[PDB]
Amino acid sequence: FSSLPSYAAFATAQEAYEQAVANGDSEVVLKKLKKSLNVAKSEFDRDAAMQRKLEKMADQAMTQMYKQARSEDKRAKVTSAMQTMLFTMLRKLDNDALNNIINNARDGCVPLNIIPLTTAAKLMVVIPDYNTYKNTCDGTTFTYASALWEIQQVVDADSKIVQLSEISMDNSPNLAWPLIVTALRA
Amino acid sequence: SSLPSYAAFATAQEAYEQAVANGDSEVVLKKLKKSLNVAKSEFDRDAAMQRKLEKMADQAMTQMYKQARSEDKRAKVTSAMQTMLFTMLRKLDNDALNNIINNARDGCVPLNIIPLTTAAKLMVVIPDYNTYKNTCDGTTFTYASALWEIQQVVDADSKIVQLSEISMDNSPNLAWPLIVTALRA
Amino acid sequence: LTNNVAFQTVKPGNFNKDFYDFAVSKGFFKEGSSVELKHFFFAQDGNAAISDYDYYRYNLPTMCDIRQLLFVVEVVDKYFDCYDGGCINANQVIVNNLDKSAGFPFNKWGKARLYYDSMSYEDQDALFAYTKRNVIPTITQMNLKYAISAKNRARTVAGVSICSTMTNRQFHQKLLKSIAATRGATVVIGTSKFYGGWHNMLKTVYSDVENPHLMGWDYPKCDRAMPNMLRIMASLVLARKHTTCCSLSHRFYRLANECAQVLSEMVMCGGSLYVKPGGTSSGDATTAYANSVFNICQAVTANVNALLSTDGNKIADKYVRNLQHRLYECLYRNRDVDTDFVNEFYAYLRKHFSMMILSDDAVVCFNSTYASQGLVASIKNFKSVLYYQNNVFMSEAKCWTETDLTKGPHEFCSQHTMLVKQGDDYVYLPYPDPSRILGAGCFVDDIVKTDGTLMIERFVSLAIDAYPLTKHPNQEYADVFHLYLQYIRKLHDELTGHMLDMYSVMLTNDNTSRYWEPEFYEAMYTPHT
Amino acid sequence: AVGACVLCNSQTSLRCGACIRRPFLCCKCCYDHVISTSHKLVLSVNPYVCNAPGCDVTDVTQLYLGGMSYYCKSHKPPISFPLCANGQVFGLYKNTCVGSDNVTDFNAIATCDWTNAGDYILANTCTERLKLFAAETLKATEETFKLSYGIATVREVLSDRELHLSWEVGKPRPPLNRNYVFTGYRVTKNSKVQIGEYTFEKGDYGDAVVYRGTTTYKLNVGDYFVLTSHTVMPLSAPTLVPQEHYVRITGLYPTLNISDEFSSNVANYQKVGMQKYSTLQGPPGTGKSHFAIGLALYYPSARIVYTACSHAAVDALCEKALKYLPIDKCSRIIPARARVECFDKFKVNSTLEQYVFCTVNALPETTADIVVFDEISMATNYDLSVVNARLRAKHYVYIGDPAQLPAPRTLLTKGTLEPEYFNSVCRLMKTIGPDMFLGTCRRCPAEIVDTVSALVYDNKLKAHKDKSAQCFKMFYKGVITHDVSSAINRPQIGVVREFLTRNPAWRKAVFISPYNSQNAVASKILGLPTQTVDSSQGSEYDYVIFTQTTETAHSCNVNRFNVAITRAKVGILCIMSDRDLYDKLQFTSL
Amino acid sequence: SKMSDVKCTSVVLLSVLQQLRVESSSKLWAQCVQLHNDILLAKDTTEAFEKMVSLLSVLLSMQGAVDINKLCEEM
RNA sequence: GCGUAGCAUGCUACGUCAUUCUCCUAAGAAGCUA
RNA sequence: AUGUGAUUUUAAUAGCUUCUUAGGAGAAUGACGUAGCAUGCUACGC
Ligand SMILES: Nc1ncnc2c1ncn2[C@@H]1O[C@H](COP(=O)(O)OP(=O)(O)O)[C@@H](O)[C@H]1O
């Protein structure tokens, strides 16, 4: 706007009009000068007010461009996170037993629901009350899923360790049920 | 409206009012019409920007108020909530709540939730012989506006003592604070 | 998944003491009042999530009668004939809110915005077209709901993954947004209760039924007891609009994807994957509309049972006797649809059993003479149908019957209805439960909503909702609107005081003067706009 | 953000600019602080710099608020007004502020440099809030000046995720703490102005740091990061909780027939019980540190928190508690730093026990029944405020003697501080007198206590012991090797070695010297456990080997000799350089 | 208006308890939530007050959490 | 009577500014319902 | 020397409604400027 050649034309027209004011020339010459000054105003406002919309459009594109650059930077970060998650789960797989059970399958397809049941090395039993404890995991070893598990730990709802001698019929009220017992395949 | 543009517009309006009162020739009257219109256009152009700035100022004031008050309200929430709790809890003015609060002020706090079912065990610490005297009478115990029956009085030494030893003359010998285990009646 | 199970609790609501003090100073909450607090923020211990997921044990494997389901399907589809649907490109799907969670495991890395931005349109269409010839099992979390309710049982919602919602939107959204843009149909979704919308709904329900009687039933454990066969039926009725865009294998694999991601899929309930026995998950991409299709199915099955189980020699109207004869013939003696009779029975139902369905909540305007004779479903028919197609007993103490239309349905969408006078005519206005509005004012679910002066739009919206109470005959009910208006006035006064102390100049253009005048709200229940 | 005025507590939003601690200020109070001092920069919710594209005019007396921005005199708009007008600086809560006349002292507290000895006396007799602010700014100034940093500058900007680092050789470098801030100091000539506060945590690969900044400008080539500010934790609790006198023991349950050794202090235990906070003043080795334990044994059911500024005093208290109190039901707290060795005989890091021991800087936000603050002579107002803020306790007991060495105060290098200005409790003791007093030496022989009963105390200290005659006074010149600005005396330690073989009973003594380097090198020369004068306060030692290194002002002060020598339970050997000190002591001439 | 006041005091009291980290002890948070939900779903004021007493006994039992003296003196 | 030029009035087209309203979209806060 | 903390941390699909800001388009009223047509008048020429 203010830097445009049209601004220079308007400025020189205004300077000529002011000089004619200082000159006090005839009305016709002044009237013609006014016509030249006014067309400069329209030309000034023809180019200006397109600058405002020009800069408005440029800013809108730049802000959108900033957004798209940020979008393509979050995509890479989440992709890297997903890759790391998948590979870290891979390193957790018990490959020997998984291979043993999948090689037995005919098509190579086995139901997902048994992949842990026959390959998971650690089992967690959540128990709501004492009767269920006595019926499911009494003692230090128990039998689930046709396997023999040995209880390595027992925690309560507060994640506080609970020694296996504290779980009694009379000591049940003092424990923060449910109890999570963690055992390992034997 | 406190602006130089308004000064120009108002002086042009006054000049045009004087001219129309005079009712002079059309050329000057219509020239003043045009000059008044252009001055008004300039004044309104400036007033639009004034109003835009004023509206931005109002938006900023509102947003600043919201932010300041939200951070203030989040900053002190524990203390405000506790003071509100006790304001309401005094407003209730119940006998049991007042009794347990006035006892807890003196140090006679319960070591476990006060039970509701009949014949349930309550363990309350008693710190003084005056607190013992006011609440304990004979082998009865007045707490929470209810009468409990004392089962077992122990000391800070965890040695079971009997209600006989608890006497004004003998009171200093006992290792306070006592712990009274009682049952609802 | 983790080495230790996670226990999730629910916090209690934050008391708004200023509003409660104002209310009790305005003569509310007195002993023996008709407007008493009943809606509170109930808290739950650590056994909330898994003791609420355990309610899926009410979902038994139900084997629906097939020769009758394959006719209820035709009628229910006739109910969905005004609409149009199909597949849409990834660049036509419009998400409502993009900051909502993205299920599991995607919630670890961002909201739904991250995955709707990271994925171009080309690789969105790629995933969608991948699902049309493949099955993508998916995990759905069970999130505990922190909202005001009238009963202490925990409320749980199934947060479905983004890999499922993206494709289900691309599949269903055309039909789903055509349902929400049609007025005067059976499924009133997308119809507002403002600007004379409730009256229009209640007067299109009365679509010229001879001896009207209003009825409303209730499905106990609607989303946890819905049989798998009927959820599959709803998903297949919603997918009859892809007669051209999709082939048949494409449609079957889309149905398989819906069943694998919604119906019976792995549910992550506090750091542990369980198996969902069945029943609709109430957070998938099509939950209101699928349940609407279910509700119409149950209504039509009740009608069929009521019409067939009728004696047949007692039916005097010789047209209805022949209609029953042909209905039995078309159920248990034909293997191909009979579209003429399907149209005839659909016309019969809409002439004597006008319905209005919102996603589980139905108002019917059934003919009374036929219902007494037994030629159209009544409450006992619905109870029987629910007993043998849901494995739940629909107690008659929660389903209402209204014999007088001049006071509208007893309760639809938790809004009672009342016939008031507006201008020169009479209109039905919905008013809520006053206890609900009072408990929404008193118990906010955050500590910054307790300030009040920050939240005047909260009370403006609550007053918009509670305006109809002003026209209630019970004065203690009508006082709630004026309570809210006076509280808004006080909030604005003290807001101006605080903002005039925090500065030396008050707001230049404070146009809050219209929120404490009844005209602004009075204009919200007038048909003009 | 808003806050409260330091010196009137009214709501406000005007922080000052050139104060180290970045305080909040009221309107009138800010006008008086900026119109009278050299501090001119002011921070409202937005700074008060000029808003021209290039201009730096921060003097609030000049700027004008126009529209919604601030412009200097030259760039002023037509319609505006100045900020500093009508006796106030424009800000929030303009006309709900009440000023105060305490700006006469606040100006001095925020203006001074804490190097003179008038600054410290000013920061101990003003109002409580001014006391707290002065202590806070003093700690900040110490952390900025003493052991400050080496000038670091980023060579290049690899990325905004990780910055580059280059420490200047010749000066040390402080580590990461979000409380540290390294001001930006691009000092070439182009806008030498703070470009933000930054903290630097180095990575595990190469030369790169994952910095955390507070501004939004990329690092220039010449930009440097200079440690010119540290953000101490803002403290709130007063230096001393208000006193309230009782008529009976409340919250504490006395015993009968407590013991034989502590029978004399029964009345003093009652006095502790009957007041909120009590102060015990006792010359060294007179029995304060076991008076705490006797307090414990007189209120067995009362949970107790022993706390002290240093680690030696808490360790001495641990020794005595293990010797007298049930070892099982005690504890000891160690910080996450775990830098220094501690007393590992109780169940460590067990806060919920009935007898906790801790350093004031590592206390947990808990309660108690009585908190015994030991050796307040080493306590600044900051430590008192911290212990008051963290530990809510029914009874406070401040035990200490001002005559012993004060806190370091590294900045203090001119003038001298009287005992009664070390902190608030010392002022209370020396002004209105201690609440308890017990002067009778019980640790060191009668000879040495008789010696010290004239230098510092006017023979008001009695002794109940026998002169062991094992107090050897030796006059060895001890040529000085001023190596690391800490005197090392090789001839002195050699002479100790040659006379350490002559004394079979002194082979397990303890080495003390007023210089850290000498103490550290004494360990290798002769293998004794060395402990400097500063960190040996509180412990008890049987045989002590002291070596006054140089004739100076550090090692020559009487109080440091007092605390160094009074630690000898049965005997001590002292080497000397100053003759005047040699003139008045009563030791064996050797 | 005393019945509709215990129901609000219980909400405030349970918020206070949850801000003191009673949520971290399941055996106690279960009882607190039971008492809260029972007070809210109450009709007779006597039962509500009795459960209010039992629930406030949780807050009074823990000594290091609140400072009853300071909070009660002000009111 | 015709032309060129000038002024006033009316109308049409275009350019710019101000006011009001409607909608289309985008973003943000909030409320209710299933 | 006081943040080797805390980002350790859940919150669905869909509908309607209120409020705020920004952009665009459209409409209407008014004002100034340029061009075009018509009427009235004036200077000169024919
Ligand atoms: N009543 C007493 N009788 C005999 N010896 C005591 C008595 N009280 C304390 N002591 C001895 O005096 C020493 C005082 O130690 P301490 O309290 O550290 O001195 P201070 O506190 O004066 O510096 C203890 O080591 C203890 O053995």
Ligand SMILES: [Mg+2]
């Ligand atoms: Mg001592």
Ligand SMILES: [Zn+2]
């Ligand atoms: Zn399709």
Ligand SMILES: [Zn+2]
């Ligand atoms: Zn300053």
Ligand SMILES: [Zn+2]
């Ligand atoms: Zn400037």
